[PDB]
Write an enzyme that holds these catalytic residues in place. Structure first.
Site, PDB file in Angstrom:
ATOM      1  N   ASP A   2     -11.952   4.204   5.383  1.00  0.00           N
ATOM      2  CA  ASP A   2     -12.008   3.564   6.862  1.00  0.00           C
ATOM      3  C   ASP A   2     -12.476   3.235   7.144  1.00  0.00           C
ATOM      4  O   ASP A   2     -12.779   1.918   6.954  1.00  0.00           O
ATOM      5  CB  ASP A   2     -11.531   4.755   7.848  1.00  0.00           C
TER       6      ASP A   2
ATOM      7  N   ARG B 206     -13.844  -0.364   4.722  1.00  0.00           N
ATOM      8  CA  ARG B 206     -12.338  -1.672   5.412  1.00  0.00           C
ATOM      9  C   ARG B 206     -12.919  -1.734   6.757  1.00  0.00           C
ATOM     10  O   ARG B 206     -13.301  -2.782   6.442  1.00  0.00           O
ATOM     11  CB  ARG B 206     -10.983  -0.330   6.485  1.00  0.00           C
TER      12      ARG B 206
ATOM     13  N   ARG C 117       0.013   9.856  10.835  1.00  0.00           N
ATOM     14  CA  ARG C 117      -0.240  11.192   9.725  1.00  0.00           C
ATOM     15  C   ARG C 117       0.018  12.634  10.249  1.00  0.00           C
ATOM     16  O   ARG C 117       0.318  13.471   9.121  1.00  0.00           O
ATOM     17  CB  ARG C 117      -1.437  10.937   9.169  1.00  0.00           C
TER      18      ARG C 117
ATOM     19  N   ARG D 208       4.041  12.068   1.965  1.00  0.00           N
ATOM     20  CA  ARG D 208       2.878  10.494   2.604  1.00  0.00           C
ATOM     21  C   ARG D 208       3.738  10.187   3.775  1.00  0.00           C
ATOM     22  O   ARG D 208       5.091   9.810   4.533  1.00  0.00           O
ATOM     23  CB  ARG D 208       2.920   9.434   1.445  1.00  0.00           C
TER      24      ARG D 208
ATOM     25  N   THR E  83      -0.179   3.179   0.283  1.00  0.00           N
ATOM     26  CA  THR E  83      -1.817   2.605   0.079  1.00  0.00           C
ATOM     27  C   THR E  83      -2.170   3.139  -1.034  1.00  0.00           C
ATOM     28  O   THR E  83      -1.486   4.719  -1.812  1.00  0.00           O
ATOM     29  CB  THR E  83      -2.625   2.294   1.523  1.00  0.00           C
TER      30      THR E  83
ATOM     31  N   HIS F  41      -9.629  10.351  10.494  1.00  0.00           N
ATOM     32  CA  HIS F  41      -9.119   9.861   9.704  1.00  0.00           C
ATOM     33  C   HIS F  41      -7.189   9.076  10.126  1.00  0.00           C
ATOM     34  O   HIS F  41      -6.578   9.929   9.946  1.00  0.00           O
ATOM     35  CB  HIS F  41      -8.824   9.743   7.916  1.00  0.00           C
TER      36      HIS F  41
END
Ligand SMILES: NC(=O)c1ccc[n+]([C@@H]2O[C@H](COP(=O)([O-])OP(=O)(O)OC[C@H]3O[C@@H](n4cnc5c(N)ncnc54)[C@H](O)[C@@H]3O)[C@@H](O)[C@H]2O)c1
Ligand SMILES: NC(=O)c1ccc[n+]([C@@H]2O[C@H](COP(=O)([O-])OP(=O)(O)OC[C@H]3O[C@@H](n4cnc5c(N)ncnc54)[C@H](O)[C@@H]3O)[C@@H](O)[C@H]2O)c1
Ligand SMILES: NC(=O)c1ccc[n+]([C@@H]2O[C@H](COP(=O)([O-])OP(=O)(O)OC[C@H]3O[C@@H](n4cnc5c(N)ncnc54)[C@H](O)[C@@H]3O)[C@@H](O)[C@H]2O)c1
Ligand SMILES: NC(=O)c1ccc[n+]([C@@H]2O[C@H](COP(=O)([O-])OP(=O)(O)OC[C@H]3O[C@@H](n4cnc5c(N)ncnc54)[C@H](O)[C@@H]3O)[C@@H](O)[C@H]2O)c1
Lengths: 331, 331, 331, 331
Positions: free
Chosen positions: C165, C168, C105, C98, C247, C192
């Site tokens: 997303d 959110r 990312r 991660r 997360t 993403h």
């Protein structure tokens, strides 16, 4: 001419006050496993998160809030000041130091007793009429501690106790018999620790006492070694800690269980930590797990288990171990 | 000593007061549908059932009570009396006459107003602060009557409305497009009856406006006949009544959805019946469905939907249709 | 005779074959979040957990197993092996690196492709017919890699994408307008990550287009700064990572939602990662999120959203951003 | 140029086949109470409704479908031809004649045996590997009947049996003790009728045998008249029938209970009707309620309750009453 105002025509305003608010003190492994479990079960309309770690606290609040779409708990709040806690029906306490590998829950008492002398007065100030649910270890000793500082009635101070211990027991029985745990009944009483008592005399499947069929079952020497099932219940914490570092999912699940019986007032029976002076010929101020009917007022009644003399003797042994500690504190 | 006194050690009495109490007024097809649906969604901690038919009443209560093992609502009570309804957060009124085959809901007005004249003051007196959810037909006109008799602010007097008609609309749209009702958006406003308005300006799947892709959609006499979907919505009640005699499962689901937004204070938007004086050029005191934001206090806000000139025209003729019957003020 | 043979009379053996089996690949923060969330939504009858870290693995399994009394998934298993994953309907891959604080990312691509090269053929061999749900970052690029290695049709290779997303986004919109996320509609398409597109042409509350009431909404430099909501969406991951380090709760909820639409064959529309060659003028083999209809067979359809020239422009630069990294084909 | 085609870009097509299909034979009081209960518990992805009443059948299908928005079961179908039933995991049978006021369930055998000779062959033709759940009365006799005609293995033919009788018992105990029913354990065995046997010797709260505390409890003369609790269990059907005309909610709830243990394969213990030849020294082909572990294959095991001679004698009495009927049929 704001977007809001062109869109929405206001009638009413911002009442606030919640009907089913739950607070979670401590947002670590256990505290968020409690939180997630209690949110998925849709028990609160308002959850309050409290921790001294500011960053961690705001970070886990935000991760839970990001998940709002998929939840049915529309107010998620957090803070360091206890004002956020105001008028909680239930306060889950998960804060404190946890077990290191090979560490006894009894070693934690100095550090966690200092945490409680600090938070109990702060949570009772904002929620004078809450049900306190203590999870922190050593949970039987801390439940007494909360009782002693809070000044509350013995019904509104509960320790998570042997709810977890009896679920692992049922689970282990269930795997030997090939029956779902829900269907194997078996009580793990006393201390949420090394001195817990299995009540062999009450273990059954569909009303049948496994001890009348197998008199050798239990606190001895010969068998199919049923006795080792109690012993893995005792080592289960140590083994999970050694493998992942700590335990979280099963206690979070067992806290939502109690929290549903409190919030819905079902009056279900659960092995939880309560004050037992005047019950097994225990003459002191001990808190240990007994079967208790749990509702909206907390512990409204205790069930007088019929215990055998092997059984009744390991329960007095568990209760002395425990008051040997308690007597040395007195804050 | 009773077997009770031997088994159980009592620690408290106290005042068993409900926190999430729901009252269902009228234990007919619609009442019990509402009731079971609310019990399976575990929204209440105590449900109270009132009906004039003493036997029916006891019977439905006992049937629901014998399924206690499978629910999470510990207290289920009834009475003809209304003392049993005290401190309810919500009360669902399903009492009265329903349509015979081919009968307009507007025709039941006279008989249902006569029963509302007795039930509202008995409700309003024992739960001064409940939210009234009106299901009895014609729902729009009884919602206004309920309001008027009660003395309650408008926020706390809700008709079930087009929640149901929108569900039916979404279902039908759903079928044609090959997507679940949940991903098809669209609103039926106005009268819960023959005069309801399809708002085709707003029907969408993922934010895209079907009226933008197909300008001929709906209140257009042109090619794929989307307009026949609205006629099926209008006609659907009449049609289930001719085949089974009454409708019940859809409206009991529709009411527990609503009930959900109120008890958890969700602030979700539902097409429901409320007072629309002031909005959309409506000068008379009529109740009809418009998108409303629902919460622990009832309707806190109304969304101002931007209607096409033909959709506004049709809403007005819908309020004109209810007002025509509404000048009868027999109360 | 065992206590088992005395208690229970056996009538059958048989082949315990799972009907609703779910595999979670990687038992880290994201894996267990997915796992608990799927177990509390009671979507599976058997869950299998695979990880390379043998101890962590056993530990998380045992913790979940000890909460058996409180769940309805009777069989919970693990292994490093993949024989344990057989006949899965869905497999959720959360294995890999991660982001560290401040890391894109896209930077994890190289390390995660190296692990997908080994995990996909072990998955594809034991559940020939599973649906692959890719969560590992960069999710868009691993979804394409997963596809490519597997040999599976595109319908059955799903990236978790902008489901999260969009959640959110709806949350944040929600706050400002005073309505639950559920009644605020709006989509985040594309990557993403940093290049995601807000589709402001489609943001609505009850069918009304916020861009119609406020033409300056969003990809406009003008007055109430709705555009800052999209920047919070972009930034939200980075920000929870700086505060708690990773997360987990939002994406585990987001995955069980998805999981729900697949297992029950719901045909709901979710913004997820799929192959968009052909649509929106995209000439290269890239994966990104577009509204898709999800069911028992994976993605059966793609919704064609009508993008404004500026929204299309931004989607294309998002596919242009993924393709730039995608010419690295190390597999 | 259809709306659909401008909106949706098709990838895949209309697979069909369900993974968790449930059929309900008979859409009357019980059949729809089964249906509603099973839909609310989200157990099926496909429900099939069958009745000879065409109008009623289509009418209740439509009322359930209108409720699609609020459900998570996307295919609801119905018909008179059994083809609709194809490849059902579970088939709930609720069809037949019901009790008039003061009527014994044993009077129904002529009329309901004619219904079963007709439907059993039709349901086994389309679903050769289904779990049959018989609800119709007299349920013990009809379960034998289904077994005898179907040709199925004794595990796949279950009668709802004393699942309901034991829930009312628990409920009645629960009200005397002030404990939730979930927490009072008590078995009602034998015939789902007038000859049912209470197993006094196994009734307990938190592992404590109420008979060791109160030896007078049960099948006598002196007490606190615990005996009348079994007697209201026996008259409960008659009394509800006299008050509302029939019973529906509790059986619907008790069918969803069994249906969850079958669908999820939990292997829970339930008092249900099964073949008992070779177990209580009953040498014939009787079907009566015994504690059975229920899963995805149906009844996989029977629990050998330890019964006293008062108890064992009323169970042989219940089993003779019952084969006195069964022997006269032989179809
Ligand atoms: N009762 C049971 O069965 C049970 C089971 C397992 C875990 N435990 C216990 O739960 C407790 C927590 O374990 P864990 O993994 O979550 O620990 P953790 O390290 O992950 O988290 C503990 C939290 O306590 C917080 N904290 C410390 N001082 C505080 C104060 N005044 N106010 C609020 N929070 C404060 C921390 O900042 C930390 O976030 C331990 O005492 C442990 O043994 C109980
Ligand atoms: N709004 C909606 O969408 C919609 C949906 C369906 C039905 N409804 C309406 O629901 C109402 C009830 O429908 P139904 O099928 O259950 O009818 P029903 O006859 O089955 O039950 C009506 C019940 O009301 C009780 N009742 C009558 N007067 C009463 C009084 N003063 N106090 C208490 N109880 C009283 C009756 O005794 C009977 O039990 C009808 O008006 C119907 O048109 C509305
Ligand atoms: N798509 C989304 O929205 C999003 C959301 C959050 C996180 N994620 C991604 O989730 C992935 C996992 O995140 P995390 O917090 O759980 O990480 P973590 O380190 O907590 O857990 C990752 C786990 O993967 C396991 N793993 C590594 N290589 C493996 C292999 N070959 N086989 C099996 N297991 C292997 C590890 O052993 C470890 O248990 C990361 O790539 C992260 O960026 C995606
Ligand atoms: N086992 C238990 O605890 C239990 C409990 C209560 C009710 N009962 C039983 O359930 C049965 C039904 O009671 P109910 O109120 O729903 O009855 P009901 O009158 O409301 O409905 C019976 C349904 O059977 C249908 N039917 C008749 N012949 C048929 C055929 N070949 N195929 C399909 N359907 C056919 C009817 O058309 C009718 O709709 C009765 O036998 C009754 O005693 C069982």
């Amino acid at each position: 001419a704001t977007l809001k105002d062109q869109l929405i025509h206001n009638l009413l305003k911002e009442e606030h006050v919640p009907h089913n608010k739950i607070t979670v003190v401590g947002v670590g492994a256990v505290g968020m496993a409690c939180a997630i479990s209690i949110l998925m079960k849709e028990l609160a309309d308002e959850i309050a998160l409290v921790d001294v770690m500011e960053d961690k606290l705001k970070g886990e609040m935000m991760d839970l809030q990001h998940g709002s779409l998929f939840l049915r708990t529309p107010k998620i709040v957090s803070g360091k000041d206890y004002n956020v806690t105001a008028n909680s029906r239930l306060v889950v306490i998960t804060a404190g130091a946890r077990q290191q590998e090979g560490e006894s829950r009894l070693n934690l008492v100095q550090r966690n007793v200092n945490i409680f002398k600090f938070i109990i007065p702060n949570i009772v100030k904002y929620s004078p009429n809450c049900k306190l649910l203590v999870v922190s270890n050593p949970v039987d000793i801390l439940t007494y501690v909360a009782w002693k500082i809070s000044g509350f009635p013995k019904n509104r101070v509960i320790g998570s106790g042997c709810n977890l211990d009896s679920a692992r027991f049922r689970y282990l029985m269930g795997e030997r018999l090939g029956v779902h745990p829900l269907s194997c009944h078996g009580w793990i009483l006393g201390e949420h620790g090394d001195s817990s008592v299995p009540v062999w005399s009450g273990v059954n499947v569909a009303g049948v006492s496994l001890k009348n069929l197998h008199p050798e079952l239990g606190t001895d020497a010969d068998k199919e070694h049923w006795k080792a099932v109690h012993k893995e219940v005792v080592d289960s914490a140590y083994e999970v800690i050694k493998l992942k570092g700590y335990t979280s999912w099963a206690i979070g699940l067992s806290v939502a269980d109690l929290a549903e019986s409190i919030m819905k007032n079902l009056r279900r029976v659960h092995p939880i930590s309560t004050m037992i002076k005047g019950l097994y010929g225990i003459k002191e101020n001990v808190f240990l797990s007994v079967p208790c009917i749990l509702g909206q007022n907390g512990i409204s009644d205790v069930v007088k288990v019929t215990l055998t003399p092997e059984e009744e003797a390991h329960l007095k042994k568990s209760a002395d171990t425990l008051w040997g500690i308690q007597k040395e504190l007195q804050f």
